[PDB]
Each structure stands twice: as structure tokens, then as C-alpha cells.
């Protein structure tokens, strides 16, 4: 597998919008540079689908930051999320006057 | 001037955000080569959408 084909596959995994049109052979030259090769190899190993934040979530998070609400650190999130039963506890539809 | 700046952002992204040991990080001069042609748009994407 030519270094270039690996790179293009990684990009597809990372949901790059123009990734389907890219031919691997066009990037084989990037791996010929003895000095950059270690970095590119690293990148193609280190970057997976779990690392990808869609533009929507990033915008939403920036909005959250801008909203002046404190961004909970990982420890705090862990504490609070524990308290979260996966189970679809239907959003307590606040007993909509309708429910009452 | 634009290539040099992106090369710095990529370095920062690689070292600060993805945790690449500073010792293994290619020289800014060397990273500038990655922003040649169509590769430039790709790495811009990577810097923006790919996080730890």
C-alpha cells in the first residue's frame, strides 16, 4: 500500500467532504520526503473517527462558551453524567398543564 | 506569509491538541511543504475539525 493511499483512507475516515475524489497516487510524493514521513505516519495512525467534531457541534459549543455558561471540566461532567441513566427517561415532560 | 502561519497552527494542533511530543515535531520549515497545492485545504480541515 503506497503511503499516499493510506493518507487518503485516513482522510475518508475523518469525513473530509472531498475525500471520495482524491486518488492516493497523487500524494505518494509527500512520503518520499524522509524528514516528513514520520509525522505523516503518525498522523495516519493517531487520527480516527472519534476525533472528529462536526461543524455543528463546534458551533454549538462556541455558542455555549459565548452564552457565559461555565464549561464543565471532564471531572465535573463525569460526576454529573453518572447521575444520567442512559434510559430514555423521557424528558420529564414537565408535567405539561396538560399532564396535570 | 500565509503558509508560514498555517504551519505554526498545525504545529500547535499537533503538539497541544493531539499530544505529539515536541521532539518529534518537524521544523516549521519542513511543515510548510504540506501546504503546497490541494494539501493546504486538507490540513486546514484537519486543524479545525479534528480534536483530541
From Swiss-Prot, chain A:
Domain of life: Eukaryota
Compartment(s) where it occurs, according to its Swiss-Prot or TrEMBL record: Cytoplasm, Cytoskeleton, Microtubule organizing center, Centrosome; Cytoplasm, Cytoskeleton, Spindle
Entry function: Contributes to mitotic spindle assembly, maintenance of centrosome integrity and completion of cytokinesis as part of the HAUS augmin-like complex.
The family this protein is said to belong to: Belongs to the HAUS3 family.
Quaternary context: Component of the HAUS augmin-like complex. The complex interacts with the gamma-tubulin ring complex and this interaction is required for spindle assembly.
Protein name: HAUS augmin-like complex subunit 3
Part of the full-length chain shown: 1 to 100 of 597
